[PDB]
Structures are given as structure tokens and as C-alpha cells.
Design an enzyme around this catalytic site. Structure first.
Site, PDB file in Angstrom:
ATOM      1  N   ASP A  32       0.862  -1.215   0.000  1.00  0.00           N
ATOM      2  CA  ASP A  32       0.000   0.000   0.000  1.00  0.00           C
ATOM      3  C   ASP A  32       0.885   1.246   0.000  1.00  0.00           C
ATOM      4  OD1 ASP A  32       1.122  -0.379   2.450  1.00  0.00           O
ATOM      5  OD2 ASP A  32      -0.445   0.701   3.461  1.00  0.00           O
ATOM      6  N   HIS A  62      -6.217   4.564   3.075  1.00  0.00           N
ATOM      7  CA  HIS A  62      -6.641   3.193   2.675  1.00  0.00           C
ATOM      8  C   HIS A  62      -5.691   2.154   3.269  1.00  0.00           C
ATOM      9  CE1 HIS A  62      -7.554  -0.212  -0.072  1.00  0.00           C
ATOM     10  NE2 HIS A  62      -8.785   0.166   0.283  1.00  0.00           N
ATOM     11  N   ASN A 153     -13.529  -2.001  -9.178  1.00  0.00           N
ATOM     12  CA  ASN A 153     -14.633  -1.093  -8.770  1.00  0.00           C
ATOM     13  C   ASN A 153     -15.495  -0.786  -9.996  1.00  0.00           C
ATOM     14  OD1 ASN A 153     -14.394   0.515  -5.871  1.00  0.00           O
ATOM     15  ND2 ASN A 153     -16.033   1.176  -7.149  1.00  0.00           N
ATOM     16  N   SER A 215     -11.714  -3.275  -2.229  1.00  0.00           N
ATOM     17  CA  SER A 215     -10.311  -3.252  -1.735  1.00  0.00           C
ATOM     18  C   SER A 215     -10.298  -3.606  -0.251  1.00  0.00           C
ATOM     19  CB  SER A 215      -9.722  -1.857  -1.928  1.00  0.00           C
ATOM     20  OG  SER A 215      -8.701  -1.909  -2.914  1.00  0.00           O
TER      21      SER A 215
END
Length: 269
Positions: A32, A62, A153, A215
Site C-alpha cells: 500500500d 486506505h 470497482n 479493496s
């Protein structure tokens, strides 16, 4: 026991924390760009390759979410992921910008080839393919690193990259119980799915926050697998795929669903 949203309530993660399993002794990487410094996430490892160096801890938001989604500590305060402790790493492979270069996703999938522990999640998906990325997954299977990339998405009739391929599993989001979510992506290579339409977790600044997406639900399956490897620290990413395959629910269908819901109760029992 702890306080979790319908997202973890359907992942049979509590029943596991009550059986005695702790996923302690396992190792999972978190590709990430910031896991936020918090008293609920214990950073056991982390390496930043991509350029733009904000901080090995925090930088976006996130990332931290995925962190508690893989093993939010079980101190009672804050949310509770599927794993309690475990070795939650932080492989800043992407930049807070939105997507490091292929030299980042590759160096991240290759740095795990050696210190990529037994598991590694990839909540990303670029439309730009690259053999440099294949050389990275080549370094990941050469050492055996279970990867569980997310879905997307909503974008064309395909899933993330590599996700689809690269020996990396691709997760998807779901709706009320298992039906297909509303913004979840699909393709001819889906691995599993989960509830990704609201998920409260930790946040930087000593605060928590809720968000919806595939996610977040991706690292939920990444953690479940962590618990499995724990019950079997001598198994490999292969033997694990077996238990997790016959243990994970199985909607059916010809390929759309085919194993989509997870539950640590059938993986631990």
C-alpha cells in the site's frame, strides 16, 4: 466479542478468535502507501521502494484500513480484523498519488520473493500490463508467496492487474449476503468475494472511519488465509489453497461466483 461491522460479521472471524486461534506466527505483506501509525496496528516489517517518500507509517489512509482488515489487534478498543497479531508488514509499493510505476509493483512483488513472507495482498489494478510485473510474480512463485489481489470497482468485463493472472488470486465485493455488489468488477478469473459495501476500521490521528469498496473486503480473505497457515505453519501456499478452497463457501455457477464467501469456522473448526 469485539465490535465489527457486517463485513467481519460474515467472515466468521469472531468464532475463530473465541476458539483459541490467533493467526500468531504467520506473516502477511500489505502493498500500500501508508498503514497509519496506530496503537491497534503493530508494524512488524515494512519497506518503501516507490519514489515519493512520505512516511513508512501513514501518508494516505486506505493502506491503514487494509491493515486492520488483515489483523486489527484484538485489544477490544477499535475495530477487530480477522487476525489478532500476526506479522503485519507494510510494503509501500504504491505511492499516495494513486499508482506507483510498474517498477514499484514489480520491486514490491520481487522484494517479497525473498522477504515476502508466506502471504502478500495487492489492493491495486493498473490497466497497463508489463513483463516487468511478470518478472516480479516470477520471483514470487519461485519462493512461494500467496498473493490475493483485489478486484476493482467496475471497469470493463475484466478484473485488476495482475489480479486476473500472475498466480495472484483476485477478490470481489458482494451485496446483502453473496449476490454481486453494485460497483464490484468481474472477469474470467475471479477467485473469491466478500461484503465490501461499508467497513468501519482504524484511521490515523487516533480516529476510525467507515468506507465501502472491494479493496477493503480483499484483505479480509487475505487474513482468513493467514489463520489457516497458522494452524499449519509447516504447510505451503499450495496446501493452504486446498483447505481454503474446500473451506470457503461455494456459490457455484460456471465461473462468476465459484467460491465467493469465506468463513474461518470451516477453516478452523
Amino acid at each position: 466479542a469485539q465490535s465489527v461491522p457486517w463485513g467481519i460479521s460474515r467472515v466468521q472471524a469472531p468464532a475463530a478468535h473465541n476458539r483459541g486461534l490467533t493467526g500468531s506466527g504467520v506473516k502477511v505483506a500489505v502493498l500500500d502507501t501508508g498503514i497509519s501509525t496506530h496503537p491497534d496496528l503493530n508494524i512488524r516489517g515494512g519497506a518503501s521502494f516507490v519514489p515519493g517518500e512520505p512516511s513508512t507509517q501513514d501518508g494516505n489512509g486506505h493502506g491503514t484500513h487494509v491493515a486492520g482488515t488483515i489483523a486489527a489487534l484484538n485489544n477490544s478498543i477499535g475495530v477487530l480484523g480477522v487476525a489478532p497479531n500476526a506479522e503485519l508488514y507494510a510494503v509501500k509499493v504504491l505511492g499516495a498519488s494513486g499508482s506507483g510505476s510498474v517498477s514499484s509493483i514489480a520491486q514490491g512483488l520481487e522484494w517479497a520473493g525473498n522477504n515476502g513472507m508466506h502471504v502478500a495482498n495487492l489492493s491495486l489494478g493498473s490497466p497497463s500490463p508489463s513483463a516487468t510485473l511478470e518478472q516480479a510474480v516470477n520471483s514470487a512463485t519461485s519462493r512461494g508467496v500467496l498473493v490475493v489481489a483485489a478486484s476493482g470497482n467496475s471497469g470493463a468485463g475484466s478484473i485488476s492487474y495482475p489480479a486476473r493472472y500472475a498466480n495472484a488470486m483476485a477478490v470481489g465485493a458482494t451485496d446483502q449476503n453473496n449476490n454481486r455488489a453494485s460497483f464490484s468488477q468481474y472477469g474470467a478469473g475471479l477467485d473469491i468475494v466478500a461484503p465490501g459495501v461499508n467497513v468501519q476500521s482504524t484511521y490515523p490521528g487516533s480516529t476510525y472511519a467507515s468506507l465501502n469498496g472491494t479493496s477493503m473486503a480483499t484483505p479480509h480473505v487475505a487474513g482468513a488465509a493467514a489463520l489457516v497457515k497458522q494452524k499449519n505453519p509447516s504447510w505451503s501456499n499450495v496446501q493452504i489453497r486446498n483447505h481454503l478452497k474446500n473451506t470457503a463457501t461455494s456459490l457455484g455457477s460456471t465461473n462468476l461466483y465459484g467460491s465467493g464467501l469465506v468463513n474461518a469456522e470451516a477453516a478452523t473448526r
